[PDB]
Structure 1
Amino acid sequence: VKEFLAKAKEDFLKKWETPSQNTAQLDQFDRIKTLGTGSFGRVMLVKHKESGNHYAMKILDKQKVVKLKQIEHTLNEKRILQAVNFPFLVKLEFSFKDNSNLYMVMEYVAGGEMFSHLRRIGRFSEPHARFYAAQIVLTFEYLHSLDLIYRDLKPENLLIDQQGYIQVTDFGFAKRVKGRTWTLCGTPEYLAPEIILSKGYNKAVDWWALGVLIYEMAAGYPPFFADQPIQIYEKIVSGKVRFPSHFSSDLKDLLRNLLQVDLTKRFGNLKNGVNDIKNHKWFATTDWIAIYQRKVEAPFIPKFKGPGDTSNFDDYEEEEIRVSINEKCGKEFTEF
């Protein structure tokens, strides 16, 4: 692991230091359909005229990005995506910009979000929750090793691929930090309490959110949920968790370790790092290299009805991407 990690750090820094830029123009792509919406822009299925290959394009509006104060997280997103490479992370293929928007084009993962299936199927059995969880304990072990912190793990961001495996997408709050950061960002359910208490936080938030993930996945609902964000953060912070009776002792001991309010005692934040996780009773069946190798057989597999099938994605309402004749936020975005 450490060996691979080492070789993997050098490539990171090589693309980290001289990032790629304006790799494609819009003209080459065909707008087919919106696959998702978000807080600062949208993702749509696109087809590359020249190669007849399909991609997801994440359009970002430069002025909406400056209004919501997202200027520095958009460049961290572009810069970690062009620089990373792991099996469970989507690949950014082309990035370019224009008078009105910023674009990231990356592989289309047809399977739909884990979210659609988790809410449809209702909940996952522990075998299946564990299948996905392994992929995140490793993705994080890699991300983290590169001094990256991904700060937005949730259903809605793990896309399921043709072989039933994960693809973490949206690196819109990833940050490379040795040491602490203080931004309030995330999705309210997933926020570790340190973030809502403004204490200055670190990599460990990613382990509290993985503990939130395995709960939602195996139970059908988040461990703290309410109508108002406010009422959610009130519950997070108290950190009194109740578990469903169908949870194995082991899984309840794992969650008990991950949704731990005291960073000092939080799994993943301790002395053996991520090995306290990889070795905990629950993951004893887990052949970690087989996982990595993408040769564990997938639990669930979506039916892709051929090329460019969007049926595993909800229907959104199309807005026209339109570009102004006057360059919009010029200076701010000069390094995208």
Structure 2
Amino acid sequence: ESVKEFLAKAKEDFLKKWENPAQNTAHLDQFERIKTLGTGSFGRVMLVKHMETGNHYAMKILDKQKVVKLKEIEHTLNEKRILQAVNFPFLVKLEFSFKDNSNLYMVMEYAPGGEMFSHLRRIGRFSEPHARFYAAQIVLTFEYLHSLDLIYRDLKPENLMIDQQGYIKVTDFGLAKRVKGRTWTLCGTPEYLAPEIILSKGYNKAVDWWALGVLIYEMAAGYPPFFADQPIQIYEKIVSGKVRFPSHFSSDLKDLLRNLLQVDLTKRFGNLKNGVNDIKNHKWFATTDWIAIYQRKVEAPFIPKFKGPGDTSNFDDYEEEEIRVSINEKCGKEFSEF
């Protein structure tokens, strides 16, 4: 019933799937490809329809050659191994995965409400209650992921899908990693990077809590706390850490954000002995029923308009490309475990 209650069995389930991942559970010819919903470095996500069931899904297609070239094999293997092992209401569900001579495929649940990013940019900013509804789901999601020793490392509105009920599905696990203790890769999105990432220090799950501070600020303000035209200028602002707030931010919101956007690790909320409860019991979340959120019993502030299955009105248009499959297998050993 509560998230903590769920965690007992959930960790056991996750570890079993993590240790013995599912492979090769569909084939490309089982899906009709409809429309591109998004792109990334090595490919794209398309709306597809599973011909046997008629169900719609969001299929990520990655070009193996492009991945190897840019030396991102391990991160792509992390993405799939983690996604196939997790199970949480606010995470996109992986339904199938497979590979062919050219590409890697992950067939995920389709979130027809589109990206939070789209709605946030259009509307400008969210009210504090609206932002708080979303933030609470992220707090619960990180409680889950962190309990499994997973760091997510790419929180931003672009990666927070909205489902038919107005709830979040976190997607794009390309930077997610299972690590006990510290890791060192300089990765993430500039606006969302914790100072310790930028300073090449070694870092832990506390970076996700820093990023939560950036997300809540951006949701409530309409712009992130640190922005500039060049990433290097953004990094300088982050390490300096001198956040200023809009005058419309409540006192409680500002206090929470000062504790999340905390450069000092012995002081950052989410990274103290009391863990997630420093955040859950903060005054800004006084109206939040954590069990009701987890059980999706709270009426969402925003429900996307949805004109039947396969409608994509909540997504931007992208240039379409033919999916090419070589007659020769590419990079087979590198992606053996996929």
Helix, strand or coil: the match of 1:106?
A: strand
User: 1:318: Cα distance to partner?
Assistant: 0.4
Moved more, 65-74 or 236-245: 65-74
SS for the counterpart of 1:285 is coil
Name the SS of the counterpart of 1:242 in structure 2: coil
Q: Deviations over 1:253-296 (max 9, x none)?
A: 00000000001100000010000000000000000000000010
Counterpart CA distance in 2 for 1:58 and 1:212 is: 27
What's the TM-score once normalised by structure 1's chain length?
A: 0.99
Cα deviations by residue, 1:4-50 (Å, 9 ceiling, x for unpaired): 21211000011111110000010111110000011221000001111
Give the SS at the match of 1:30.
Answer: strand
C-alpha deviation, 1:3, in angstroms: 3.2
| Deviation (angstroms), 1:119 | 0.2
Residue pairs, 1:1-336, within 5 angstroms: 1-336=3-338
Compute the TM-score of the two structures, normalised by the length of structure 2: 0.99
Contact 1:76/1:175 (8 A) holds in 2:
yes
Shift of 1:319: 1.3
Q: Secondary structure at the match of 2:44?
A: strand
Q: Give the direction of change, closer, same or farther, for the CA distance of 1:290–1:125 in structure 2 (3 Å limit).
A: same
| Residues 184 and 196, structure 1, Cα contact 8 Å, conserved in 2 | yes
Percent of aligned pairs sharing the same letter: 96
C-alpha distance after superposition, 1:97-149 (max 9, x if no partner):
01100000011110000000000000000000000000000000000000000
Could you tell me how far apart the structure 2 residues matched to 1:279 and 1:49 are? 47
Unaligned runs of 5+ in 2: none
Question: Is residue 189–residue 222 contact of structure 1 (8 Å, CA) maintained in 2?
Answer: yes
User: SS in structure 2 opposite 1:3?
Assistant: helix
SS in 1 for 2:286: helix
Partners of 1:159 and 1:4 lie apart in 2 by: 23
- On the 8 A contact 1:40/1:68 being kept in 2, the answer is no
Determine the C-alpha separation between the residues in 2 that align with 1:109 and 1:2: 26
Instruction: Please say if residues 260 and 266 of structure 1, whose CA atoms lie closer than 8 Å, have aligned partners that are also in contact.
Output: yes
Q: Is the 8 A contact 1:99 1:326 kept in 2?
A: yes
How far apart are residue 62 of structure 1 and its match? 0.3
Q: Which sections of structure 1, spanning at least 5 residues, go unmatched?
A: none
Q: Name whichever of 60-69 and 243-252 sits farther off.
A: 60-69
Q: How many residues align?
A: 336
- Supply the distance in 1 between the matched residues of 2:146 and 2:75 (Cα, whole angstroms): 18
